[PDB]
From a paper:
More recently, with improvements in EM techniques, higher resolution studies have homed in on one particular kind of structure for the myosin head arrays in relaxed muscles. This configuration is the so-called interacting head motif (IHM) first observed in 2D crystals of isolated myosin heads from vertebrate smooth muscle. Studies of isolated myosin filaments by electron microscopy (EM) have been carried out for many years and 3D reconstructions and other kinds of analysis have revealed the rotational symmetry of these myosin filaments: 3-fold for vertebrates, 4-fold for insect flight muscle.
Author numbering:
A (entry chain A): 800 to 840
B (entry chain B): 1 to 840
C (entry chain D), D (entry chain C): 1 to 156
E (entry chain F): 1 to 196
Write the structure that this text describes.
Amino acid sequence: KEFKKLQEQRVALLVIQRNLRKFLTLRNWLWYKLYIKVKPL
Amino acid sequence: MAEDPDPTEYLYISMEQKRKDQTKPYDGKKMVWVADEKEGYLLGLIKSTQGDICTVDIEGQESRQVKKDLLQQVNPPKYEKCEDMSNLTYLNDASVLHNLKQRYYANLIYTYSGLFCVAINPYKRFPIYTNRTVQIYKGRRRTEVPPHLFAISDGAYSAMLANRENQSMLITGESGAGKTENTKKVIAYYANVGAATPKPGKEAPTKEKKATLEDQVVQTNPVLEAFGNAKTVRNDNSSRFGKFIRIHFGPMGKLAGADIETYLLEKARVISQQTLERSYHIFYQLMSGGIENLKADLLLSDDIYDYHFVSQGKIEIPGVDDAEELRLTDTAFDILGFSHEYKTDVYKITASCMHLGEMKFKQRPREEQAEADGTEEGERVAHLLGVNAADLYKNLVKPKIKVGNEMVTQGRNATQVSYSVGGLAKAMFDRTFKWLVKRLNETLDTKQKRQYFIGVLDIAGFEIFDYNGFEQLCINFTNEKLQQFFNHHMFVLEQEEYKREGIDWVFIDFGLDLAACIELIEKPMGILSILEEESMFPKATDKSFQDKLNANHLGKSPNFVKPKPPKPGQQEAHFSIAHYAGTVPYNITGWLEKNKDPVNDTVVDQFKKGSNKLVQEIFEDHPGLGAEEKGGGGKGGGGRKKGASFQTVSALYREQLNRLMASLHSTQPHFVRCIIPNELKQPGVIDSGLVMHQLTCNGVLEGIRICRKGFPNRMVYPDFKQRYTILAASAVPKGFVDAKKVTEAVLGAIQLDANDYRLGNTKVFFRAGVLGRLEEMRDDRLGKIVTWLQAWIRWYLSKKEFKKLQEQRVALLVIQRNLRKFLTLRNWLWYKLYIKVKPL
Amino acid sequence: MADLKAAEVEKAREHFEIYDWEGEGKIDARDLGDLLRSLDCKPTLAMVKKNGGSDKRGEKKLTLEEFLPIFSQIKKEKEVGTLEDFMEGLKVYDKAENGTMLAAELAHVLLSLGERLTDIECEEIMRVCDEDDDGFLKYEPFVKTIIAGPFPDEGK
Amino acid sequence: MADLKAAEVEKAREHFEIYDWEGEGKIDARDLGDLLRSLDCKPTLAMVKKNGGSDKRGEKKLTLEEFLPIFSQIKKEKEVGTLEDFMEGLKVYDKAENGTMLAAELAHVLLSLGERLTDIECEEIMRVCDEDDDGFLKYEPFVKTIIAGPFPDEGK
Amino acid sequence: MGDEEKKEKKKKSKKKSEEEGGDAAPAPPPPKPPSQKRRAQRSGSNVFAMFTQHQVQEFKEAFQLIDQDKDGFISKNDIRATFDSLGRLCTEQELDSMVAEAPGPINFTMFLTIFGDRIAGTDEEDVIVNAFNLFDEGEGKCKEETLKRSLTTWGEKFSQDEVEEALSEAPIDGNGLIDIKKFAQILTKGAEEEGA
């Protein structure tokens, strides 16, 4: 019954693995973020 | 029209006379009805009258000096070729007798006898299937709707829906009327009030697709009938048992379901037979009707006299088979939503109750004990239970009789042994049927609409043979209590309802008692019986049974035939008890053995037990009925309470019996007093002698004294004002107001003749005659305004329910007026959006 | 009554324009039925089927150019009906002394008179207050929403 | 069940990517038992050791190839939904069979014999069944409740 | 109205605001009584101040089409002509919209009562649910994506460019632009891309 929580995690594991690679890719390719705070112009 | 209703469903009148003012100066007097000495009423002429005494001759060929009040003056043409018999005010047996004869001749069956109807029941079925029926019992005239049981059910629905408080329709009767056959036409009104959704292309056809609640309410009566109905030859299709049906009706009258309980069932119509009793209808169904699949497995013959509890062939009554009646009921399981499994499992247990018969006097040894040289006979029982041929043939022959509380045996010879084979069958059939209703009742607890019911009570069977069972006796102790709801509703609750409503009538109650010594509470009824509460032990004396009878049943009962006991040994005593039907010679012995059980609790209980537990649910949840707490002692069960108790389910049925009876006591009466017309159960045959007898015990004088103002039509005074339509005005109401003497003005304004009305400011009250046919002529006269509303409703429907040509168009054109310029009009001179735009 | 006059031509163009939706000026066969009814010729279902109409799904498309040499025949023998007649008529049934009408009861009296109401239309009379307690109409907003038509066009 | 089905292999390829947190494959030892339990095979801790698998953390871990002979041994033996010694393993304090045993001896006999599990579950075998004040609590329905199951079939 | 007829009474109906040149004739016939004119034009009247903003710049974006001259007071139809075809985006038929957002020549002085006359204009304020809403069989608010739908399946036919442009230029609120906002468009919610 709990394996249900884990069964929707089978596709989710495939998303965090590409995203961890993009944690370093977009840190060599910055100017791809900027969202509301006090720094925008 | 031409002032006769149009035949579609069968037995509709085509009149000669009209029940209107002409008929009123005919009344008596020249010819009268004198009572025969051979039972019945026939036609006599007054030859000389000596004042208060008269000499009235008979076609019996006697000359008789009679007393005024006895000789009924001849009933006038109001009951000859009229829809009428609602206007009855004429006393004693004969008044009714003549009129029901002329009812057959007038192409009808059921008729009003005032509010308290008489039903003469042969059983015929008019088609219900037509899209014609579902307009007819969707409310129409009082002779488009016939004076059959559909009428009363219209005027209950119309009543209930105007005054917003509850009614009942309570059928009494005796053996020679099959209560249930009547009830399915009450339900066929209800079940065909229905209409269905519009079709989009303007299609008039639709309906006979709606709705499984109505279907369910019907279908249950065949299921209940196959088990509980057997037959007689005085009473073809004899329900021998008792069932209480609460039918629930909607906002539009559409059936919502039916909470159906079961009272008792026989254990005496399959333990042996009396001459010209048939066993339970289902056996023969199963046999003749069977498909090749079940025929193999269940090991069935279509031959009879290869049994002994299944003997007697087909009995002639219209519209009943055994074979086609199988398919009806098999479908009637399917429709209920019952399990496809449990049908065959139940059939396996059901069919052994045939197979069992033809076994007697098995002392031939195989193992140095009473068994039998049979094989096939008992193998066709054996396989269907699981248990082998030896388990069977051992345990049949004699019961383990609790003597003290330990176990002894008696010597038992051929008949004794016979009767004990029949034990095993009656314990199975009672117990399966008892599980069975209650698990089907669950599904029928969906309502989802208005919470108004009528409760229809059907407790029938009685029987007049040398032997009836103790089971039938406890059923007839209800029958006594039915005659008390008659007393209580014919005097009392009828005119309490007349008073409340404020309808005219001098409020007078006459004395009659048919019982009053019985109480509708459990505790008095369950001092009885010593053939219950001590019989499972040899301490039970038939003596004390009668003594406790004579206190509790006799004192205020009048048609009760006293016990005269044969002092030696165990009774062959006879007594009888009040009912509409005759004296019964009882046999008192054997009642004993049946609640020491010829085939025990234990022996049955182990076919109940399973081997995956799925088997168990089908018969039991687990306390009692197939699983046992053990020990000796107790009453009832099963194996609560306790163990091999030797069943006394009749005591449990004091308790519950209080619970059915008292609520039904307080409900306002619609009544049907079902009379035996003839034994053969056939239209155009009626017997005088039977009807003469049934009506003297059903207090017919008193029963017309209040019901001389009987109204079994009750509707809405607006509704009836509107069906004639009133376009003339000087002072004519359109108001919701009294009908005391006002009904004569909203008729006579434009045309119409008037003979029947009664006061009403909520429910308006009618009797049959003058209304109905004059309202069919308003189809012919009403052109103009009426029919143009109807054409306008066609223009209404069509505009709304095309589903695209409706309010779609107006919007779509304004939608377009934006679409032609959508690039422009989604902005203006000054672009103001700088807030939340996909690139800006 | 009325003969062929500008006012009728408008009445017919107006009902037709409601009855399309395609924007192609084509209405189906069945719609001849209720067009003629709205025009106040008071046809029966017979008169519809006479003009090759239907009470089933359409079979073919009609332009107004077909419809009008049917219609100029239909106009002969007709009553345009009054309004006040249906009010006076329906006042006869009451249920509060205010001209209020239980829904079932209003279907039933129509059913059992005239050419006789179909299964479907009694469901439509009933429809408003369906399957609850049954269910009260009032004569004045009843007749009025019917004749007015439910959105012939509005400015809101 | 009583034999491997083709869909239980197709189920196990999908559920392989769950067990390894990367979305790859490698069955965790406690999640060894969760795969057998989502494929209708629910051995004991002493039957797991016979098949050579696992159902708890710290035991051998395997790959999905290696999972097939382990899974196939349970099919040959009990616990795939078979009946014997479940609701046949209860009752011995009653020499009566009414399909009931004592309340007190239906919650501290799973705790004084058995592999021994939670007091909450000891309270579910008492909750599913009927209650009377005669001291008679049924044993045989809590087991059939398990036959009904969250999924009678292959979990998902 | 026959086949032929509803071609004619686009050009012949034409009940203000619908008396505009169109894309291939203006709006599809309203039925014979003139109730529906009110959904053809709505008009309010609140004036809003000029030079109070700093998105006031917008008037300079529009300017050139509505002021050929460097101090304006050009010809009076030229607002009603040119601005139609690429001012507040492409495709002409902005005739009566323009004659109802300008009450004569527009210039920087005149700007108070055009900014104000935006809120009078056509299908401005007088917010009502039922107008578009009754299409989808009265079920939920009738928004953008069903209008696009309708233009390629039913109704009279008009230039497809304007619609595909209009969806793309949507702000997005998530249920698109409801009837409320289709009227109330002056106060929040406008367009993107080329022009004015």
